[PDB]
Every structure is written in structure tokens, then in C-alpha cells.
Structure 1
Amino acid sequence: MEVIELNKCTSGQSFEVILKPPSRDPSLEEIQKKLEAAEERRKYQEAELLKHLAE
């Protein structure tokens, strides 16, 4: 029913039509910690494996 913000150029145009109106991200430091806790867990699993195998 109602056109607004009509903008035209050589490339084309744009506008808006209304029909009805209306009724803290991780620090570099934390990212490093969780990468490293992870690698600590990998390395521990693997060193346990190497233990059992030595047995």
C-alpha cells in the first residue's frame, strides 16, 4: 500500500514497501588454554598407550 525510500541510479533502484505497521567473546588467552588442555589430554592418552605397550 505505501512506498518509501525510493532510490534510483543507472544500475537500478531500491525502496521499501509497508503493508501494515507493527502492532563478551573469548580472549586470545582462553582460546590458547582450551587448545592446550586438549593437547594435554591427547598427550596423556598417548603416553598411557606407550605405558601399556612397554608392559
Structure 2
Amino acid sequence: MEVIELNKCTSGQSFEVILKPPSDPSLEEIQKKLEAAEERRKYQEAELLKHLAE
């Protein structure tokens, strides 16, 4: 039961008590994912329009 690193100031204080010792995607890559998904949306909408054109 030890207290360490006791720091005190006008608005409070803080310390540490020890009870026992122990024993990314680049900017270019993110644009590809966004544009890839937008392209799959365009393809699905084109098939719908093509279907409606038939």
C-alpha cells in the first residue's frame, strides 16, 4: 500500500497507489474504396434503367 507521484495544486491533487507489483490506408487508397462503391451503385442503377428500358 504505497503512494507515489503526489502532485498538489490549488484546484486539486493527484497521486498513484500501488497494492502489488506485476509478475493505415493512404489518402489515395481511401478514394479508391469510395469510388469503387460509387461505381457499384452506378452499375446497379444502370441495370435497373436497362431493365426499365426493356
* TM-score, normalised relative to structure 2: 0.97
Query: Percent of aligned positions with the same letter in both sequences?
Result: 100
Could you report, residue by residue, the CA deviation over 1:4-44 in whole angstroms, capped at 9, with x for unpaired residues? 00000100100000000001x00000000010010000000
Gaps (5+ residues) in structure 2?
A: none
In 2, distance between residues paired with 1:28 and 1:9?
A: 44
The runs of 4+ residues in structure 1 deviating greater than 6 Å are: none
Give the count of matched residue pairs.
54
CA RMSD of aligned residues (A): 0.4
Gaps (5+ residues) in structure 1?
A: none
